[PDB]
Design an enzyme around this catalytic site. Structure first.
Site, PDB file in Angstrom:
ATOM      1  N   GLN A 157       0.811  -1.236   0.000  1.00 35.07           N
ATOM      2  CA  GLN A 157       0.000   0.000   0.000  1.00 35.07           C
ATOM      3  C   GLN A 157       0.841   1.281   0.000  1.00 35.07           C
ATOM      4  OE1 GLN A 157      -2.091  -0.399   3.820  1.00 35.07           O
ATOM      5  NE2 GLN A 157      -0.210  -1.401   4.533  1.00 35.07           N
ATOM      6  N   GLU A 182       0.192   1.296  13.189  1.00 32.23           N
ATOM      7  CA  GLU A 182       0.322   2.717  13.520  1.00 32.23           C
ATOM      8  C   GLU A 182       0.874   2.952  14.939  1.00 32.23           C
ATOM      9  OE1 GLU A 182      -3.235   5.926  14.837  1.00 32.23           O
ATOM     10  OE2 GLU A 182      -3.451   4.632  12.974  1.00 32.23           O
ATOM     11  N   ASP A 219       2.240  -7.201  12.544  1.00 29.82           N
ATOM     12  CA  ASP A 219       1.742  -6.456  11.369  1.00 29.82           C
ATOM     13  C   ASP A 219       2.494  -6.969  10.142  1.00 29.82           C
ATOM     14  OD1 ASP A 219       1.383  -4.189   9.293  1.00 29.82           O
ATOM     15  OD2 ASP A 219       0.154  -3.387  10.932  1.00 29.82           O
ATOM     16  N   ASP A 252       2.405 -12.457   8.963  1.00 24.22           N
ATOM     17  CA  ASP A 252       0.993 -12.789   8.925  1.00 24.22           C
ATOM     18  C   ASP A 252       0.576 -13.296  10.306  1.00 24.22           C
ATOM     19  OD1 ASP A 252      -1.519 -13.563   7.384  1.00 24.22           O
ATOM     20  OD2 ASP A 252      -0.947 -15.501   8.242  1.00 24.22           O
ATOM     21  N   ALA A 253      -0.505 -12.742  10.848  1.00 26.23           N
ATOM     22  CA  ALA A 253      -0.930 -13.071  12.205  1.00 26.23           C
ATOM     23  C   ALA A 253      -1.339 -14.529  12.353  1.00 26.23           C
ATOM     24  CB  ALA A 253      -2.074 -12.174  12.652  1.00 26.23           C
ATOM     25  N   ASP A 267      -6.923  -5.522  14.821  1.00 26.69           N
ATOM     26  CA  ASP A 267      -6.855  -4.153  14.328  1.00 26.69           C
ATOM     27  C   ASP A 267      -6.394  -4.194  12.868  1.00 26.69           C
ATOM     28  OD1 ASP A 267      -6.947  -1.431  14.253  1.00 26.69           O
ATOM     29  OD2 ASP A 267      -5.164  -1.144  15.485  1.00 26.69           O
TER      30      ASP A 267
END
Ligand SMILES: [Mg+2]
Ligand SMILES: [Mg+2]
Ligand SMILES: [Mg+2]
Ligand SMILES: [Mg+2]
Lengths: 289, 292, 292, 289
Positions: free
Chosen positions: C31, C86, C106, C137-138, C155
């Site tokens: 992104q 974040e 994250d 990857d979670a 989140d």
């Protein structure tokens, strides 16, 4: 796209450009100043939320404003610019090998300094020993000095404080007395679109037609202005060169190659469309004071 | 002013016109169709959210598309339009007293029917006994019959859009399908997309160069259209010369065309056909040729 | 006001914020990343042209995401965040004196590094010895270790976006990967997309119902976030009850949380967890379950 | 999308909705009137370029404005509406089986007629024999008649001409004397967002707190308003019903099912967030004249 600069071109028409960033800001007592990095037009100078100059196409405007006038003069040595604060008009004039003095006369010192700092394209022009920068109103500056000029260039805002610099009285009694014998005047003359030309271009053309023996209106598309733009040449000597003679003079007199303007381009630009030609013919309005 | 029509000229440049109303709509599986009443440009025809025609200045596009080709021809009697569904191309053609037949070949019958009903400027044109409307692919239509034409007019979408129109801009189409259906002295003209100082490289230069591979004489020309927000281009192509003076063009207009043109006189055409330094050189050096 | 940040909330609804400046950017192959200085909302983090966080009101989202889950737990010591790059989720977690370890997992290391440098509100949080940042990857991260957590926090992006996050909202993920890594009394909380009168049906209702298939106690709740231009939702889920009074929540906040909350007190949570008639009924009747 | 309606919500924040068409236009001497067909919100009433009502969510606003006040009254029979020109407030009031008279008092007759013509949702309400439409300023209408009311509803614009209808003096000396014993006042009270609530909601709440013994502020999201919106109940009798009692009263007293509001919804709406509750507490401003 996420980020946009928006400007109202006219009451019913708005233009929006995608933004990369807001590069620098300033102000004078007179105006707000911004240099934007825009996606379609590169770096863009904005004064009071009106786009003044865009990196990608300002060469068109400044080549059109400057080169025809000088090329039609037999030997232009000194030139006075009413406005021209960004430095690009002076840049183009200083390319002429005959020129030994350029005076740039603008009211807003902070704009000139902002552009000297941040318009990289004009860094050399601003350092040229032939350039003098005068901070004054152009009428007052022209009235208060006896020097006459081979060429005078109108590079102000459209006709407010600048309106008086397009009147028949100004032209007849202030501007001509500062033109030397064989001198040439050129002014930018606002939008010159099939309908937009009636706002000011037709009035500027008609007002100059009252004062000078020979007047040549011409125009060209400037993408970042959202219209065809206009200029008017005026002299008491003929303004008549072929495309071929213009090209020869460009090679002889101008350092480096023009990017926009050759002789045929000028001939095209000075051949207005049927409706525009007739409308200039029919124009009765004359700016007075 | 709270209501706006908005169009992305480029992905990075947006044009917005204040709206009086949204008058009418249609749709086919080809495209959505809207007629808007705008403040700056009057009534506007929008196809898939791209303005096609605006009332205040469509005369410029259609006079530039039509009149140079017919005026350079010594006696044009029959004409074939590729596209032209709005009716305005046919309208300008039908102003020529020499003309006996116009064939309008458009793929989207819904656009034709919408415009025949809603664009009243073209009502005369659509009811003229000289006009034949055919609903077909223009390549298929031309190949299917032996009739030849004095002028063939391309009034299609830009080839960049890459759908059913793209093949109608290729070298092989022009050489093997179109040129065989032109009469002696025949002239082709096509719209040729944006023709701005930078925008001309997308398709205008490519269309020019592709035509240069097929016809001896190729004359690109351009003119500003306010509602398009750019200089627009067209290209004439012929195997007979295309070199008339301004005055000879004016003489022909006076003799042949009903009513006075609003945009185009001979000097305007000469100006239009004199491109700027950079555009001339860019067209001269173009090597892209459209092929399938 | 000439410069604007614009966002399409829906394809038919656009929100525009006046811009002071465009401060910083990054990008990964996941992104694009931008930090904007906006007039209405202060500094704003935008990921792929969607506002993620605004300075004036991100406290609402992060207090609502974090505090209800931890306060309902009797003694939460370790926490796993899915996403949260974040840093703000970690910041709110680290306000709890009970907490000994926060793991922030994250996928996009560039977002983490950008925010650690540029979001100064979270600088303390990022340098806290209790915080571990993992780039993975979670699902893979949780499956790869036997460590269990008192609270796991989702989140992540909405499952509608359908990329690498989608699997982290499925029934099987929750049942077979996540629930095995919760301790006795463990609580799951996830952000759950828009929760407006009409917008709640896109994902909020589906997330609720999917959780209802896996956990005994499921408490959906919502709150307005001005910079999001909508009511936003979250869902608590646990196999132990989730039924504390306003006053008991306030008591726990006073005992456990460093500094006063800006948005959330006990009464606010009770109000948040009382959905409107139509939203309640819509959640009650939802049959969609997320699966792979 | 091609066609958009744009509105400035605040100086630095703009909202744009995609349009299907512009359905009807009108004007009064007072205002411009439009009914737009919008993609996100259906038919939308716009007065002077400000969205007033949207088809998809006006039920939220009008259910919230009307039902709590009437449900907390033991037997409300007559009601006076300050404003309410679109007819939707009256629509909701006329659903109550106890109500025998609704007066709608608005200054702009042409807006009322426009909405009677073109807001199909309110056609039945406008035909109901219990409805009287009065064209007047609400202060003048309330001063000039002796009739007292069980409920008075403020459905005006945010506090201009309407400002005087939110002052302590208006409430104390004009509005209460027209409330019957046990009467209830409710007013819309502007944006009620975490920050937007300070503009007027907090001032309206505090001003009513000076005049009435019992005051209950409450709020709810309205998508087409781009914010949480607020209302305030005020009475000299207690305003305290459980969710369960509210639901029983709704079943007994209101024809058909509410779409937005049940008892729990009201309880939620009247439980404001920490920051909003404290800010209403701290508010010192009181509207005066
Ligand atoms: Mg300028
Ligand atoms: Mg276009
Ligand atoms: Mg969003
Ligand atoms: Mg209202």
């Amino acid at each position: 796209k996420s980020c946009w600069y928006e400007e109202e071109i006219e009451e019913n028409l708005r233009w929006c450009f995608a933004l990369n960033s807001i590069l620098h800001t300033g102000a004078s007592q007179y105006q707000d100043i911004a240099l934007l990095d825009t996606k379609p037009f590169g770096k863009a100078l904005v004064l009071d939320g009106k786009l003044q100059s865009a990196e990608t196409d300002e060469f068109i405007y400044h080549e059109c404003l400057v080169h025809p006038a000088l090329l039609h003069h037999p030997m232009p040595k000194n030139v006075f610019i009413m406005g021209g604060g960004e430095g690009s008009t002076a840049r183009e004039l200083l390319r002429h090998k005959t020129i030994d003095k350029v005076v740039m006369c603008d009211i807003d010192e902070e704009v000139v300094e902002f552009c000297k700092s941040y318009l990289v394209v004009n860094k050399e022009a601003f350092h040229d020993s032939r350039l003098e920068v005068v901070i004054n109103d152009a009428k007052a500056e022209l009235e208060g000095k006896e020097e006459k000029y081979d060429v005078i260039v109108g590079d102000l805002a459209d006709p407010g404080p600048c309106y008086k610099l397009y009147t028949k009285d100004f032209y007849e009694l202030t501007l001509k007395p500062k033109l030397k014998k064989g001198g040439i005047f050129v002014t930018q003359a606002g939008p010159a679109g099939i309908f937009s030309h009636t706002e000011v271009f037709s009035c500027i053309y008609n007002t100059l037609r009252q004062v000078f023996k020979y007047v040549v209106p011409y125009s060209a598309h400037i993408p970042s202005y959202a219209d065809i733009w206009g200029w008017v040449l005026a002299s008491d000597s003929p303004l008549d060169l072929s495309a071929e003679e213009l090209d020869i003079r460009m090679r002889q007199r101008i350092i480096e190659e023009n990017r926009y303007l050759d002789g045929k381009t000028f001939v095209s630009s000075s051949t207005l469309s049927k409706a525009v030609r007739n409308s200039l013919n029919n124009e009765t309005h004359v700016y007075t004071e």
